Amino acid sequence: ADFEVHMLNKGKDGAMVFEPASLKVAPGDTVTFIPTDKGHNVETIKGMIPDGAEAFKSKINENYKVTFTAPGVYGVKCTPHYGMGMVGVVQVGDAPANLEAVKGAKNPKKAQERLDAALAALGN
Ligand SMILES: [Cu+2]
Structure with a gap:
């Protein structure tokens, strides 16, 4: 299965966003940014x-x-606007083994606020 993630200057979540900011895909799926x-x-x-x-x-x-x-779990960012x-989060398959480790990764404050929200929306 193929999914699409768009990069926008302004969206429902504010400025400089990925939409959707959180996505669950299966092992082998393709996402086009x-x-x-x-x-x-x-x-x-x-x-x-991972x-x-x-x-x-x-x-x-x-x-x-x-x-x-x-x-x-994969954490993604836009280089210039990180x-x-x-930032967005892509979960590939069930029971991400690196789920706890990505939670502890250090990010700039605004990126951290959106990644925590995005991890929560995956049910993590
Ligand atoms: Cu950007």
Whole structure:
């Protein structure tokens, strides 16, 4: 199954957001990150990727397609707007083994407020 995540300058959650900010996919699913507005990209957050997973970083303005292979929770950010809180969470499969470790990862304050909300919406 294929899912879409859009990158916007303004959404229901405020400025510089990923929509949706939290998504549960299955092992092997594909998510396409699409900058609806210009100036955004997607990159994995340091310490918020499962064991076995490869980090990634898309180019600004590109539609980025990723097939998630290793199960667990992945923290993602927009490079330029990470300090402003532009972050999302992708859970791949059931019972993420790295769920406790991603909760402890350190992020700038606004990014931390949105990641905690997003982890809570997954039922974590
Ligand atoms: Cu951005």
